Design a protein around this motif. Structure first.
Motif, short mmCIF file in Angstrom:
data_model
loop_
_atom_site.label_atom_id
_atom_site.label_comp_id
_atom_site.label_asym_id
_atom_site.label_seq_id
_atom_site.Cartn_x
_atom_site.Cartn_y
_atom_site.Cartn_z
N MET A 105 0.82 -1.20 0.00
CA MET A 105 0.00 0.00 0.00
C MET A 105 0.86 1.25 0.00
O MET A 105 0.66 2.12 -0.84
CB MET A 105 -0.94 0.00 1.20
CG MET A 105 -1.99 -1.08 1.12
SD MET A 105 -3.03 -1.12 2.58
CE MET A 105 -4.01 0.34 2.35
N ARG A 106 1.83 1.33 0.91
CA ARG A 106 2.78 2.45 0.92
C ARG A 106 3.41 2.63 -0.45
O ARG A 106 3.58 3.76 -0.92
CB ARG A 106 3.90 2.22 1.91
CG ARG A 106 3.58 2.24 3.37
CD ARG A 106 4.87 1.98 4.07
NE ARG A 106 4.79 1.92 5.52
CZ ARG A 106 5.83 1.64 6.30
NH1 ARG A 106 7.03 1.37 5.78
NH2 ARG A 106 5.67 1.62 7.60
N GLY A 107 3.82 1.52 -1.06
CA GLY A 107 4.38 1.59 -2.40
C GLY A 107 3.47 2.32 -3.35
O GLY A 107 3.88 3.27 -4.02
N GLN A 108 2.21 1.92 -3.38
CA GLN A 108 1.32 2.59 -4.30
C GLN A 108 0.98 4.00 -3.86
O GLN A 108 0.80 4.85 -4.71
CB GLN A 108 0.06 1.78 -4.51
CG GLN A 108 0.35 0.51 -5.26
CD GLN A 108 -0.87 -0.30 -5.59
OE1 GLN A 108 -2.01 0.10 -5.32
NE2 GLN A 108 -0.65 -1.46 -6.16
N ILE A 109 0.95 4.30 -2.56
CA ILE A 109 0.66 5.66 -2.13
C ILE A 109 1.76 6.60 -2.61
O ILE A 109 1.50 7.55 -3.35
CB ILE A 109 0.50 5.73 -0.60
CG1 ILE A 109 -0.72 4.91 -0.15
CG2 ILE A 109 0.29 7.16 -0.14
CD1 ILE A 109 -0.82 4.65 1.34
N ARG A 110 2.99 6.36 -2.16
CA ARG A 110 4.09 7.24 -2.51
C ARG A 110 4.29 7.30 -4.02
O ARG A 110 4.52 8.38 -4.59
CB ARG A 110 5.36 6.77 -1.83
CG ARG A 110 5.33 6.89 -0.32
CD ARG A 110 6.60 6.34 0.30
NE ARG A 110 7.75 7.13 -0.09
CZ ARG A 110 8.19 8.22 0.54
NH1 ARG A 110 7.59 8.69 1.63
NH2 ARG A 110 9.26 8.84 0.06
N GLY A 111 4.24 6.14 -4.68
CA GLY A 111 4.36 6.12 -6.12
C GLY A 111 3.20 6.80 -6.82
O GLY A 111 3.32 7.18 -7.99
N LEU A 112 2.09 6.96 -6.13
CA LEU A 112 0.91 7.59 -6.71
C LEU A 112 0.98 9.10 -6.58
O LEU A 112 0.57 9.83 -7.48
CB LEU A 112 -0.32 7.00 -6.03
CG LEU A 112 -1.76 7.29 -6.36
CD1 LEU A 112 -2.01 6.80 -7.73
CD2 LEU A 112 -2.63 6.54 -5.41
N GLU A 113 1.52 9.58 -5.46
CA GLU A 113 1.87 10.99 -5.37
C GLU A 113 2.90 11.35 -6.41
O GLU A 113 2.72 12.30 -7.19
CB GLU A 113 2.39 11.29 -3.97
CG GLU A 113 2.70 12.75 -3.72
CD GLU A 113 3.17 13.00 -2.30
OE1 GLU A 113 3.26 12.03 -1.52
OE2 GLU A 113 3.46 14.17 -1.96
N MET A 114 4.00 10.59 -6.46
CA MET A 114 5.02 10.82 -7.47
C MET A 114 4.47 10.68 -8.87
O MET A 114 4.96 11.31 -9.81
CB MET A 114 6.18 9.86 -7.26
CG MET A 114 7.37 10.08 -8.15
SD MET A 114 8.17 11.67 -7.88
CE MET A 114 8.97 11.37 -6.31
N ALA A 115 3.45 9.84 -9.04
CA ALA A 115 2.77 9.77 -10.32
C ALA A 115 2.03 11.06 -10.60
O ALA A 115 2.00 11.52 -11.75
CB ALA A 115 1.83 8.58 -10.34
N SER A 116 1.46 11.67 -9.57
CA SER A 116 0.86 12.98 -9.76
C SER A 116 1.89 13.98 -10.23
O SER A 116 1.71 14.61 -11.28
CB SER A 116 0.21 13.47 -8.47
OG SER A 116 1.19 13.70 -7.48
#
Lengths: 51, 51
Positions: free
Chosen positions: B1-12
């Motif tokens: 989950m953390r992986g997708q959270i941080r990577g999702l901000e960075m995706a933003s």
């Protein structure tokens, strides 16, 4: 739309310069007329043979 | 989950830099348009032969 607007103003100016050119040509034709009138007169009297 | 959270901000942020790049490209295309309008105008009058 911008293309046709600006090109349409410039089309106006194009037509206006066209008016100007034509006015010049026509003025030359005015003085042409006056001369040809003189000519016609000179022909009438020159056709007044006998005197 | 953390992986997708941080990577999702960075995706933003990735998408946001993408916006920025595109805004630059598009600005270059704006000035491209303005120039091509000038060109079109110059062509219209240059096609006003006779004068």
């Amino acid at each position: 739309m911008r293309g046709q607007i600006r090109g349409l103003e410039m089309a106006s100016k194009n037509s206006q310069d066209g008016i100007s050119l034509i006015q010049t040509a026509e003025g030359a034709l005015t003085e042409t007329h006056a001369i040809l009138q003189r000519v016609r007169e000179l022909v009438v009297q020159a056709g007044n043979t006998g005197t």
